[PDB]
Amino acid sequence: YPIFAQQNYENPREATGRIVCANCHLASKPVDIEVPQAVLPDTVFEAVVKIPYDMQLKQVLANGKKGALNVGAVLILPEGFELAPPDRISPEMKEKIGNLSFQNYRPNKKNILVIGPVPGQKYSEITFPILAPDPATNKDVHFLKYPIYVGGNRGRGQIYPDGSKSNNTVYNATAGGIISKILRKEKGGYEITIVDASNERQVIDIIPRGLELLVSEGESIKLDQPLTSNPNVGGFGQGDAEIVLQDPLR
Amino acid sequence: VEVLLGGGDGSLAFLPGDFSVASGEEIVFKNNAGFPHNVVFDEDEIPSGVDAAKISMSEEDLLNAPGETYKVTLTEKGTYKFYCSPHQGAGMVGKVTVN
Numbered sequence: 015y016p017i018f019a020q021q022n023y024e025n026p027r028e029a030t031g032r033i034v035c036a037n038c039h040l041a042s043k044p045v046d047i048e049v050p051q052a053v054l055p056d057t058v059f060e061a062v063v064k065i066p067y068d069m070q071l072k073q074v075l076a077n078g079k080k081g082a083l084n085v086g087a088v089l090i091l092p093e094g095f096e097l098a099p100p101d102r103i104s105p106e107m108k109e110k111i112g113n114l115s116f117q118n119y120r121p122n123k124k125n126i127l128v129i130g131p132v133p134g135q136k137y138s139e140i141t142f143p144i145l146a147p148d149p150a151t152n153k154d155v156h157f158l159k160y161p162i163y164v165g166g167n168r169g170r171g172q173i174y175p176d177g178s179k180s181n182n183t184v185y186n187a188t189a190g191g192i193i194s195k196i197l198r199k200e201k202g203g204y205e206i207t208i209v210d211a212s213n214e215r216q217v218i219d220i221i222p223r224g225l226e227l228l229v230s231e232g233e234s235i236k237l238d239q240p241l242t243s244n245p246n247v248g249g250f251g252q253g254d255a256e257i258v259l260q261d262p263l264r
Numbered sequence: 265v266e267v268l269l270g271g272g273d274g275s276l277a278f279l280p281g282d283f284s285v286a287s288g289e290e291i292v293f294k295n296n297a298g299f300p301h302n303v304v305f306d307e308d309e310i311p312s313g314v315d316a317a318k319i320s321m322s323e324e325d326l327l328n329a330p331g332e333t334y335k336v337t338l339t340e341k342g343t344y345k346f347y348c349s350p351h352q353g354a355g356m357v358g359k360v361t362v363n
């Protein structure tokens with residue numbers, strides 16, 4: 015969720031240029047961003063981010079049931095650029111933004127905006143209303159080309175903040191050997207018994223509900239071998255744009 | 265017994281995350297911020313049998329809006345254990361101590 019990165023990453027952009035959501039959102043899915051080629055000082059513009067996905071897609075909800083996808087986003091603009099105030103928001107763009115709440119990543123980072131989790135079938139395309147700065151009003155902003163970075167996600171993540179995997183990822187065998195027994199759980203889930211005949215050790219691999227295993231009793235499994243299919247149908251994508259803060263003259 | 269998921273800025277945690285009720289009371293789970301906060305009772309810490317889908321939420325009924333609440337009418341006496349589906353490994357979980 016966007017709050018997981020805000021609560022534990024100071025700035026969401028890594029040194030390799032990777033957005034922090036890719037640490038738990040491990041599937042890669044395309045992200046798009048449309049921004050105006052150039053904007054004037056003190057003007058409102060729209061940043062349109064597209065997080066595209068196949069709509070008949072059903073993911074594994076955290077309770078084993080199958081459900082719809084949720085979308086989230088992280089917009090990184092240059093210093094000076096911020097979320098346009100409601101009085102500067104035209105009514106033609108007010109219905110465009112629906113009723114989303116854009117939050118700042120941290121209270122002092124007014125140039126980093128986050129939104130989500132929002133409904134997928136509704137906000138596959140999000141419009142962020144940004145206000146361009148004025149140079150004669152801020153001595154650090156200047157007329158020039160500036161970078162804009164966006165991160166877009168759709169779907170449940172695979173890793174939690176403590177390092178625990180969720181049920182939206184592959185379950186791998188903690189040890190090689192032969193499967194001696196597969197206990198189908200009453201309310202869903204499985205208990206897999208592995209006889210590591212090589213180390214004379216028995217291990218019990220627990221599989222959560224919502225996942226189907228591709229393993230049978232009496233089968234030889236290797237360490238790290240995938241025990242069930244990967245039920246992840248979502249992904250995280252990264253995009254980039256350049257904007258021209260233009261002088262009103264020439 | 266009034267549990268409000270999410271604090272007032274971004275605190276993902278059941279408040280309270282542990283209360284005591286009896287047969288006839290009603291539990292509530294109002295989500296404020298950090299949605300969705302749909303809770304689902306698991307069949308690992310339940311006292312009586314009963315199905316988990318009877319006291320848990322479905323995939324179509326999710327608490328993603330700031331105002332929806334999930335009420336569960338429990339009558340059996342024992343200690344249940346529900347948790348935020350969209351945040352089970354996060355750390356926000358509660359339990360119904362009905363007796």
Ligand code: HEC
Pocket residue numbers: 015016017018019020026034035036037038039073076082083084085086087088128130131132165166167168169170171172173174175180349350351352
């Ligand atoms: C690991 C600490 C994570 C970071 C950093 C981010 N996300 Fe995440 N996200 C993570 C998990 C394990 C989950 C699933 C929670 C559950 O049990 O359901 C999520 C979920 C989301 C969602 C909702 C998905 C859905 O319901 O379909 C969204 C939209 C989302 N995350 C977006 C997102 C963004 C944009 C992030 C970077 C700012 C981000 N997440 C970071 C784990 C982690």
Ligand SMILES: [Cu+2]
Pocket residue numbers: 276298299300301302348350351356
């Ligand atoms: Cu939650």
